[PDB]
């Protein structure tokens, strides 16, 4: 059976947007903008989007659209690099092992939102410690004795019952049920392919923007919202002289766009050959970054409201990550008129933000491994069930009582240096070994124009250089594993490094396997490993372009 195409281009576009835009855009980018010079932070961020993020996004979309393969089997163009695709698939599975747990947290909060008295508004619950204090009497974000912080930690995480990652306890049945619902939704969104995934993203990718619009219109009218917005966009150009600001912008671009993660390649593998993936790459990257910028306005409207309610400054309330959306935002919601409506819409928005990114991540695995194995391709429902059930079982660790520690370890070591290395290897294998000139010819075959010298330069030198810089800083600026005041044991750090290395060693391991499993002399084996599999009849003729300097000097 031939591979199906997207039922519509809107299906593909919304799948790409849904994967790209998630809770990161909302809970990481605004805080980075506020902490890294406000509107000045947009200069490194926009520059990196232009020079690395957009070029990589374009590269992966064009690669998927031309080769019509997943992350692993797209390396028929450079056989030695199939380990890179295997590493990307492994990283996607690893990331899903903990990302769906944050989705399950959003689902738990949404279920808890179906009340006129939100559980995070007052103390006096079973999960409340005697130190719980009415927040109207009170860094604020680090105060753990508020109804919202205590609700999160003790009635959602039950983290008070785990002393560390050495004793994580058993999975929590409420979070277990929420994870079951999340994985069932993922299965029935993924089991019948892109034909139904592309229609599910009509809701999961567009609902967040409606919710964000209503949140913005309400936030701008809140007392103190203007002060929060001013703090958000206060331009400090002297912050651009610090390497930390540029490192943060580069890391945010790389980990928000998701280029080279195996998802864009899989999505473009279902495109029509005529599709203009250049326009789609530009549009979707711009949408991701503009969504982050616009969501920062709502985030900091609420932050300014909270700072005005507690008579504190933005620095005291300003926070990021799960803490923001699960403590600070619920607390603000509990003080609003119609707090139930706001909680429901906010957590529906979090669910929509996370669900299509989980869809994209699991589609990466499913497409990549179905392209590699025909049994998996002809059994999509069974293989999707296998993937989702494995994700559920291995995410059961992150919904234990000490599941936040496992989640921290995974969020640190599953797609960090490992995914950065995998994407750098992809960029090298495409723009140097396969050839940026060959890639441009492939793009011309589909769109009738070759990419301009800008894109070829970015693919061969800038995006590889950006990725190398980000890997080097990720390794250099590694901080030992910690969660709040908890410091993980050394063996936890070793386990995290092993998780990081598990996918990264597949690249050299596959190169060694391919070299040893290919018959011939050393040069014949190298030629077969760098030559596209449909050109291996030329290796006998001793016509290998990678063995000439014109190939490597070809920009």
């Amino acid at each position, epitope marked *: *059976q031939p591979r199906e195409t*997207w039922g519509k281009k809107i299906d593909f576009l919304l799948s790409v947007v849904g994967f790209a835009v998630d809770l990161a855009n909302v809970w990481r980018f605004p805080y980075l903008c506020y902490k890294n010079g406000g509107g000045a932070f947009l200069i490194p961020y926009t520059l990196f989007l232009i020079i690395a993020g957009m070029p990589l996004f374009y590269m992966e979309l064009a690669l998927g659209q031309y080769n019509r393969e997943g992350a692993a089997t797209v390396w028929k163009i450079c056989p030695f690099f199939k380990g890179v695709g295997y590493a990307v698939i492994l990283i996607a599975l690893y990331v899903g092992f903990y990302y769906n747990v944050i989705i399950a947290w959003s689902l738990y909060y949404l279920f808890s939102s179906f009340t006129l008295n939100l559980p995070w508004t007052d103390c006096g619950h079973t999960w409340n410690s005697p130190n719980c204090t009415d927040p109207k009497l009170l860094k604020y974000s680090k105060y753990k004795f508020t109804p919202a912080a205590e609700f999160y930690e003790r009635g959602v995480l039950h983290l008070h019952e785990s002393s560390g990652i050495h004793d994580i306890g058993l999975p929590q049945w409420q979070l277990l049920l929420c994870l079951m619902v999340v994985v069932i939704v993922l299965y029935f969104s993924l089991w019948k392919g892109v034909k139904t995934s592309g229609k599910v993203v009509w809701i999961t990718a567009t609902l967040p923007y409606f919710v964000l619009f209503v949140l913005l219109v309400h936030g701008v009218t809140l007392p103190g919202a203007s002060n929060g917005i001013n703090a958000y966009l206060h331009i400090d150009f002297y912050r651009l002289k610090e390497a930390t600001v540029w490192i943060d912008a580069a890391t945010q671009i790389f980990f928000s766009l998701g280029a080279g993660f195996g998802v864009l390649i899989a999505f473009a593998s279902y495109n029509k050959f005529d599709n203009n993936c250049y326009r789609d790459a530009l549009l979707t990257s711009s949408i991701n970054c503009i969504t982050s910028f616009v969501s920062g306005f709502a985030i900091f409207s609420i932050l300014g409201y909270m700072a005005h309610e507690h008579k504190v400054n933005i620095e005291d309330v300003a926070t990021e990550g799960a803490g923001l959306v699960f403590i600070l935002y619920p607390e603000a919601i509990s003080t609003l008129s119609g707090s139930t409506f706001w909680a429901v819409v906010f957590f529906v928005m979090l669910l929509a933000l996370g669900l299509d990114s989980s869809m994209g991540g699991m589609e990466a695995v499913i497409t990549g491994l179905a392209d590699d194995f025909q049994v998996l391709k002809r059994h999509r429902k069974l293989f999707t069930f296998g993937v989702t059930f494995s994700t559920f079982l291995l995410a059961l660790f992150c919904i234990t009582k000490g599941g936040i520690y496992v989640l921290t370890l995974l969020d640190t070591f599953a797609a960090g240096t490992s995914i950065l290395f995998a994407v750098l290897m992809e960029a090298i294998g495409v723009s140097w070994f396969y050839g940026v000139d060959r890639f441009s010819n492939d793009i011309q*075959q589909m769109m009738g124009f070759r990419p301009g010298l800008y894109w070829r330069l970015c693919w061969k030198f800038v995006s590889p250089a950006f990725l190398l810089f980000v890997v080097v800083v990720s390794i250099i600026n590694f901080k030992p594993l910690t969660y709040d005041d908890y410091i993980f044991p050394p063996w936890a750090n070793w386990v995290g490094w092993g998780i990081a290395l598990s996918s990264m060693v597949l690249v050299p391991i596959y190169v060694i396997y391919k070299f040893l499993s290919t018959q011939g002399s050393l040069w014949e084996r190298l030629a077969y490993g760098i030559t596209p599999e449909n050109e291996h009849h030329l290796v006998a003729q001793r016509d290998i372009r990678q063995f000439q300097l014109q190939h490597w000097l070809a920009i």
Partner: nanobody
Amino acid sequence: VQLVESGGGLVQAGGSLRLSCAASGFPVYQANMYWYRQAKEREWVAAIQSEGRTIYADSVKGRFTISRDNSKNTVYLQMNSLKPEDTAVYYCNVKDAGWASYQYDYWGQGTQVTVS
């Protein structure tokens, strides 16, 4: 899906030759129809795409004209000012039939074109 190529033969340098691609099993008017040649590796020649856009390889641009007849479900390749370097077996290819379709990537058996 089936693709039958016809129109190839022996032509003189600078001569004209029209290849035909009779398609069955799909509508060519919404399909990405590609022409390739193999004298060497298979080389993309021209394409008439889902929305009717005609694109050509640099080697043949200005000399070849790809066109389709919706009524006959046939794609044509009008090869003008042919040169000996154009001697090859020309393959008609359907990449897909649009969006709500399948990636057929079906190839014809090829039509031999010889110049001079």
